[PDB]
Structures are given as C-alpha cells and as structure tokens.
Amino acid sequence: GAEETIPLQTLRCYNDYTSHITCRWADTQDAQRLVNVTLIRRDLLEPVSCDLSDDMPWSACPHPRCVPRRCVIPCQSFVVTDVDYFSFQPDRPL
Amino acid sequence: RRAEKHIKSSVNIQMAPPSLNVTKDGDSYSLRWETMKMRYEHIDHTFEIQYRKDTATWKDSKTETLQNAHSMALPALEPSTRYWARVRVRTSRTGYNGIWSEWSEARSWDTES
C-alpha cells in the first residue's frame, strides 16, 4: 500500500452543522524545511487558510517534533447529503 | 494517485458549547443549559453535565447523562461550600454522529449559610 502522508493521518474535520467547519491536523518539522503544504477542500478546487495552533490535534502525532495547525471554514448551511473532500497539495512543485 | 480523506459533515458533528445558567429557587438549586439553534430542530441532543465541590477535582465530579433535556434540579448540597458545574452536548440521532462538544464555562455558586 501507499504510506499515508502525516497531514492526512493527523487531519480531523468536524462540524457544528450551523455555520462553520473546524479542521485540525499536523505535519513534521523535518517536512517543513523542504516542501510546504496547503490544505485543499472541494465544485472546483478551493484552498483553505489555516493558523498555527498549539491546542494539540484531535489525533496524536507519530513524531516528537510535530507542528500542529488549526483551520476554520465558514459555510452557510449543511445537509445530510454532504461529503467533504480534503486533500493536501505541496505548494512548491517537486 | 492522490491520497484524499473523506469527511462527512453528518457523522462529524461537534456542536458549540452550551451556555449554563444557575437558578436559586426557594432553598434548592437547579441548572439550565441552552444550545445554539440548528437549522433543523429534529436532530437530538445528549447532554453530559458535571458538578463538583470546590475542594474536589473534576475526576470525582458527579456526572449525569440526559437526552434532549434542558434542566435538572440539584440534590441537597452541603452548606457554605462553593460549587462548580459545566455541560457538553453531542448529537444522538441515527444518521448524525460526532464527538462531544467542548466543556462549557464553569459556573460557581455559594450555598447559603
């Protein structure tokens, strides 16, 4: 199989079903020095802004130098037929 | 292939923390909590509400689980000791699941002498 990226493993997106989606994930300090990543949620593609958070991700991180982040996504409403696709895309190209 | 994670809004609901108010009726106390109104009123809510003495920790706090309720009376409390309480809420209807909301702000009250 394909070893999942640490941002995907550490990602947990939850909802209040009224106005916003809260997402928390993490990466590795060794990963930041080579390739910066940005969360993308998708209509067409839509990058989502995030802010550094020290509140610890909802899932534990498998490295001792993990850097966690938190994201807030404002959308007007939710239905039961909603499936949200979250992916991580390297900013600079390899 | 691009590795993507599937997150469903229906089965990942984390509601806003409730607001807990304390009312002194007669010589007893009661706790009332309110939640942010959904666009749909048919999604059930389960509330876990804890109260503890000021000298005790939250691990030894009395916990009560209520479904779709918005108030309990509290039992006879020892006089002249500070009391704290708080509440969280989650969805409990089939087709809508999630993790517990964050603990509500602790509310304190002093029992009369």
């Binding site: - | 009726d25 007669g26 007893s28 479904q67 779709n68 009376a73 039992p75």
Partner: protein
C-alpha cells in the same frame, strides 16, 4: 396573423359543496392547425387564482356564499411570446336572502376515536361545529349544517338548541373524514324560514387547522433515588408513532420550579430533588414534518410523584 379566438360555451355548474366544475369547448371557427392549443383560467372571486390547463375542464374548490366568477381564454405557447385570445368569463351569483341573517363564528373541531369494529379502518373522525345565530335572523330560523369531504356528502342530525328552538351547534359522531387525509373539508350551513330567507355560509376548513389531537394516555413516572423516568403512549390518531411532538411539564409543589421540555421521543428522563413532590403533564401534536402544524393537544391528567 395567428389570431386566437375565445372559447365558447363556458359554464360553471355547482357539482357539490364548495366545488364548481368549469367546462369550455374549442371554438368551431378557429383555424384548425396542428398547433397544440392550451387554456388559461382565472378565478376572480372570492380567492383570486389562475392556472394553465390543457384539457377542457378543471375542478376548483372555493367558498360559494360570496359568489363565483371565473374567466378563461385560449392560449398558444410559442418559443418567445404567449399569445392569448379575448377573455371569456362566467359568474355564479350569490345566494338570496336578507343581509346579516347568515351564521357567524362557524368553528368546527374534529376528534379521533379508535374504531375497534372495522378491521379495515382503525380510526374514525368525529366533527363538532358551533356557530352563533344571525343578528337579523327571525326567531323561528331553522339552520341545517352540511359537511363534505372528498366525494362524501352528509347532513347533520344531532343538534344543539337554544330557548327559541333554533340550531346552535351540530355533532357528527361518525364522519367519512380521513384522519390522515389531506383534502379540504367543506362545511355549508343554510336554512329556511316562513318570514325571510337566510343566506348560507360555507367555509373550507383545512384538516390540520381544525384537528384537535387527543391528550396522550397512561403517563407513568417513577422515582429512583434522584432520577425520574417519564413515559406515555401516543395519542389516538391514524398518524403513526413517529409523527408526533410532545412536551413534559414538571412542577415542584414546594419551591415552584417549572420545566418545559419539548421532545420527539415518547419518554423523558430528568433529575429532581429526593425531598420534594412533583406533578407531570404532557401534551402532543402532529409534527409539522408530517402534516402542516395544527392545534395542540390539551394537557394530560396530572400525575403526582415523590413525597413532601
């Protein structure tokens, strides 16, 4: 130029209580091209409405005490503009009688009872209609109430009387009104007299607006240390268990604390004092989810739990 011509033989015939069935026929002198003609109908009085109809007939429910007036015109739907002919109209007059003699405050209420005899229909709807006599009505006015639902029409037999012998209220103990039905219930109240005729009064009652949900029965509640559990049964109605809202009213007879909790389930669990007496009541109603919101059920009988 394509000049559409109005339909002819447009007549409005009263086919039942608070119905009129409109009919037209295409004009013989119209050019008979393969064009798919359609028709537009306008209800002018009393409730204004208009609709598009392909066939030469349409049934519209409406109150007939104020008279009826309808207009129809032949139309042809092109890709850019809607061509229409001259309007053709017909009207149904108001019934005769001196003004103010008609009834007022006609309020009709529908109950539901468990029909334990018929293996097909388990639930039965009973109708109670009340009204006040007219201001200028003669002392010997004889009012007769009629109700209709679907294609069923009936006349009342069990009435209520004042000191002068006139008819105030009626009670149908057995009606063909479907408990889960979602059609208009027409009620017509006309009468007769030897001094001056009385104008009728008909009114279309929505089933939801006039259906009084019964209170739920068997509301039990038990103390267990500090915990209360309250459960009951669905109220008698052809709607199933999942189509009812509820609230529970818990009052403390010692301090006065009162809790109202609306819920969709059939049981409620609460924590209260172990040194106080409590009373519990519940109400019910058909959810707006299943049927448009209606009148709420009355309070259930008090149940007294705990000790003081």
């Amino acid at each position: 130029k394509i000049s559409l011509l109005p339909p002819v033989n447009f007549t409005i015939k009263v086919t039942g209580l608070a119905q009129v069935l409109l009919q037209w026929k295409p004009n013989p002198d119209q050019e008979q091209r393969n064009v798919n003609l359609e028709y537009q109908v306008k209800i002018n009085a009393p409730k204004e409405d208009d609709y598009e109809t392909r066939i030469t007939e349409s049934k519209c429910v409406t109150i007939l005490h104020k008279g009826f007036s309808a207009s129809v015109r032949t139309i042809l739907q092109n890709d850019h503009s809607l061509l229409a002919s001259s309007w053709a109209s017909a009207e149904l007059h108001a019934p005769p009688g001196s003004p103010g003699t008609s009834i007022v405050n006609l309020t009709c209420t529908t109950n539901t009872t468990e029909d334990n005899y018929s293996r097909l229909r388990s639930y039965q709807v009973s109708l109670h209609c009340t009204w006040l006599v007219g201001t200028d009505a003669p002392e010997d006015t004889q009012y007769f109430l009629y109700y209709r639902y679907g294609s069923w029409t009936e006349e009342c037999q069990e009435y209520s009387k004042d000191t002068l012998g006139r008819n105030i209220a009626c009670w149908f103990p057995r009606t063909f009104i479907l408990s889960k039905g979602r059609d208009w219930l027409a009620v017509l109240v006309n009468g007769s007299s030897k001094h001056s005729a009385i104008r009728p009064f008909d009114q279309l009652f929505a089933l939801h607006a006039i259906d009084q949900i019964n209170p739920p029965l068997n509301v039990t509640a038990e103390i267990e240390g500090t915990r209360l559990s309250i459960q009951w049964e669905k109220p008698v109605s052809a709607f199933p268990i999942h189509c009812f809202d509820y609230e529970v009213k818990i009052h403390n007879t010692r301090n006065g604390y009162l809790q109202i909790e609306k819920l969709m389930t059939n049981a409620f669990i609460s924590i209260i004092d172990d040194l106080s007496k409590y009373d519990v009541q519940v109400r019910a109603a058909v959810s707006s989810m299943c049927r448009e919101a209606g009148l709420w059920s009355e309070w259930s009988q008090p149940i007294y739990v705990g000790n003081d």
